Design a protein around this ligand. Structure first.
Ligand SMILES: [Cl-]
Ligand SMILES: [Co+2]
Ligand SMILES: [Co+2]
Ligand SMILES: [Co+2]
Lengths: 62, 65
């Protein structure tokens, strides 16, 4: 009844440990996605600034 | 044995929770930073799209003058 409660508590900690590991696993997933998003956006923005610079020079004429 | 093992294993799993929480909090702090970065790049992307269209039109309105 001490041992019994302790064992039940140990099972509940194990379950909490599994749930925290799943949470960590989800955060790492989302982190890796945002790193990729951030690189995509930078490369997209670089392409746009290049097209703009090109247009700017065209229009520098008149 | 049994009762001392249980007590020890409990203290140990609670130790492990504390560490897993700190780890997840460290991931959240970096993620918050990446959400903020991405939001600024989205705002920039939108302004550049509008500027490109703006400029194309000026050019068209000068490719025809
Ligand atoms: Cl269970
Ligand atoms: Co990826
Ligand atoms: Co990646
Ligand atoms: Co925004």
């Amino acid at each position: 009844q001490q041992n019994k409660e302790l064992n039940f508590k140990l099972r509940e900690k194990q379950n909490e440990i599994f749930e925290l590991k799943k949470i960590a696993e989800t955060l790492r997933s989302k982190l890796e996605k945002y790193v990729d998003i951030t690189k995509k956006l930078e490369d997209q923005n670089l392409n746009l600034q290049i097209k703009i610079s090109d247009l700017e020079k065209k229009l520098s004429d008149a």
